[PDB]
Design a binder for this molecule. Sequence first.
Ligand SMILES: *Cc1ccc(S(=O)(=O)N2CCCCC2)cc1
Ligand SMILES: *Cc1ccc(S(=O)(=O)N2CCCCC2)cc1
Ligand SMILES: [Cl-]
Ligand SMILES: [Cl-]
Lengths: 228, 228, 9, 9
Amino acid sequence: MGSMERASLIQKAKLAEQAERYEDMAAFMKGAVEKGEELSCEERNLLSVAYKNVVGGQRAAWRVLSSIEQKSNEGPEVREYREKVETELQGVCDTVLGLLDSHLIKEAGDAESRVFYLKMKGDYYRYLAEVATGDDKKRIIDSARSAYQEAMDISKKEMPPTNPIRLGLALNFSVFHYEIANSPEEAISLAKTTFDEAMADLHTLSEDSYKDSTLIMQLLRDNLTLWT
Amino acid sequence: MGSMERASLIQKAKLAEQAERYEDMAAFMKGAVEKGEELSCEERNLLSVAYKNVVGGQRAAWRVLSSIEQKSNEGPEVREYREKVETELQGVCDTVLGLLDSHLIKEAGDAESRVFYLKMKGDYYRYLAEVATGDDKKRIIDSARSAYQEAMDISKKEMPPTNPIRLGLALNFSVFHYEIANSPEEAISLAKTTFDEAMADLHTLSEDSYKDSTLIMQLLRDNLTLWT
Amino acid sequence: AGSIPGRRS
Amino acid sequence: AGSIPGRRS
Ligand SMILES: *Cc1ccc(S(=O)(=O)N2CCCCC2)cc1
Ligand SMILES: *Cc1ccc(S(=O)(=O)N2CCCCC2)cc1
Ligand SMILES: [Cl-]
Ligand SMILES: [Cl-]
């Protein structure tokens, strides 16, 4: 997208979202990141929405194919096609991780941007971990953990307990503990503490901030209900 | 897909459908058609499902973008991006039309296959017509009409009035008349006659065929309710 | 006006 | 277990 203006890429990413063209949206936002300027809050959200939708469809397809493959192991085509989808998913995760490493994280100095990008880094390593098999699974899991932990440390020092990014980070790190790291008790403790500390800070919020924070709190509660 | 076996392409198209990976499904079925053998009934349905889903998402996106563009005419980015989606849609329609012309239609001798492919030819010219502007719109509209009419002539001679392909052909040709050809009275007359002649033939059908035919009859009725 | 959905084999 | 949906800006 090197020949298109930054502002035109951002405008087209918003159009692509309205058209539910998430592959295009991700390509526009990759082009925008590669212009080299930092991203605003709204631009960070466009980048994240685009890739979450792309990789979310890949993950759903990989899970369907992995389930068919496991049943068949109870010709080579199911494994071949699961491998094709898996390689495509890994390529998208590697692309997002490469944007974060070149150079979104290193230029992110405010807590809101740095936490946002480190949460994304944890998420995309988590998606790599979902499809990883063996000892490389261990290093990928540790990369997710390390990114989430750095984001947690910053968020607890610099943001209030109701901040939606802080809440979504804690939600996704709790999912990491439950689903990836085989640490359900850590998942439950993090979700409970996060929920309780947010509850106690709701009194400080406007009506609109209250709505934003309570929405994510309900997701934490939904997981606690499933896990307990 | 030249190096993959025909049977493996068909197997992967079925997996791609289960995974909701319709672009992959269409590419597998294109590869299967290009093996040069005729398609069975189930294989024709896989080809049609794959491309209908791909082009259906493109059409939905084109309509969103065209609506935004029309509101803006009441920078160049909206038009540019609508044009990009439009060109991609046209390319998919041209690909399907090229499969039908090289060489699915000419090898199709049984009524069931020939009607199926001619209905597809009408449909993909109809999708081209939806985005066409001007005098080339006229030739594209006539190409759709001609394909649908040849399919209608064969279907009325060779299939019973409850045959699901005959019914779906009549449904889609009625939509062509209403939405493309500016002939709502022709659309209504075709849908009514098709419905009534199918009703009178339901007594000949098994329970399972009855269910197949009445489902499409309800679609004809749904359009008549919207149009009258 | 609806055409054949035709999105599922 | 649900993560942030995060599919809509
Ligand atoms: C043109 C056409 C395609 C498919 C059919 S069907 O196999 O009877 N079926 C598929 C879509 C869901 C409803 C009916 C009929 C006509
Ligand atoms: C990680 C994360 C992303 C987005 C948000 S949010 O902007 O508050 N929002 C978007 C998805 C729908 C629900 C909440 C929070 C955390
Ligand atoms: Cl900075
Ligand atoms: Cl033949």
